[PDB]
Design a protein around this ligand. Sequence first.
Ligand SMILES: C[C@@H](Oc1ccc(Cl)cc1)C(N)=O
Length: 460
Amino acid sequence: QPEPDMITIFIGTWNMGNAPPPKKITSWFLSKGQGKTRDDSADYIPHDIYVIGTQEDPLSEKEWLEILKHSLQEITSVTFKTVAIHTLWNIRIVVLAKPEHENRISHICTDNVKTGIANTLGNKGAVGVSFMFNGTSLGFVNSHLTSGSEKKLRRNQNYMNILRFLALGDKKLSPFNITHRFTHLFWFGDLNYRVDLPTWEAETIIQKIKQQQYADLLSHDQLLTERREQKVFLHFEEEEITFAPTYRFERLTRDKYAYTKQKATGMKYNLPSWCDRVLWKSYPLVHVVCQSYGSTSDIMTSDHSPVFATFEAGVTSQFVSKNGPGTVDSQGQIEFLRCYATLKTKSQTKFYLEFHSSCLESFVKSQEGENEEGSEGELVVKFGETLPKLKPIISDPEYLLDQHILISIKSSDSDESYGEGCIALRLEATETQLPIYTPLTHHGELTGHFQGEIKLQTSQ
Ligand SMILES: C[C@@H](Oc1ccc(Cl)cc1)C(N)=O
């Protein structure tokens, strides 16, 4: 039975509005309703992994697992295995997988972050799950961010706190936050970004939604505009939105948006908004294709409609050779030529690099680079031809070209990372000097760039 080189992943996010679900929610898992929907001809074909994020979830873990498993079994006739379930307050993540994947899945981690201080600590934050699927690391974040049209900055702060403090994935990757720990990272939830138009335009917005004319609404979506200004979700992807705003509905119909200020809303307007979102970030040159992104039309217990997104995701096998794992393969080497980091920092310490990769026995520390002044004020750290030769565990090009090198640039004085990035080994050529490039982030904000050349030697 061969190991897969692709899997499909279902991502669901639903703010349940503290109400039990209706008896049938199969449309969610089938990617049926509005937007980019799944072909009818696929309905019996199970996804390999289903990741369900809920917010304002009133159910016990047991109650929700019984509804989810029984839903998937009715669709697929497959009894899914529970990989992980983690709840913070009313924020919940469930990971279900096909039984054939039980012995492909390992290194399961769960964590949560509570966002805010005093007043603002008590119901918002994130849950997450990570695991290995054969040679591929997968991370999943369900966040319920701060509500309110006038709190986009708070939401951006919630995002930074979650990506700094959520403890998922390989703890040996110590310089790296969750935005670098995974081959594929899916971040979804009630992100709570609103359509930023005047309150007096509510009925005009509703009109536009009834005509399925979303362009003038999406141009004011705070998540799209904040992302375009690099304020949040830097280096994440989102599929084009082609479904109506998923909030705020009158319960038990989808015919009415309930936007007017009420005591129950803290006297706040809730203009129709795309609160409920799925974004991802995969390592460079790994296959990931969104095959659905939409909302259900027939699940109306909440003031939110469920959102679905499905993905094809490239996966690799758990590679064994004569040599590695357990030793190096002298027929393999990674060389870095003419490398330099450009940092936005105003500081003057020496810097060194750390190279982290599952293709190495352990991370590699470089010598300190040479600081120069850039023409436009910047710090340029020159490594030249000084970077150490990396000794992969396996030289087979079928393995090595599928790998990635995480780079941290660290202060010699503090050993603190100033920037993290990632280089794909999926090169156009081996035994050939080729340009490489990564942006550098810290706490998920741009801090610089790393560029140079790579020369990859494999056994072929
Ligand atoms: C790894 C962990 O649990 C799993 C693994 C795979 C699946 Cl599909 C479900 C649960 C264990 N052996 O306890």
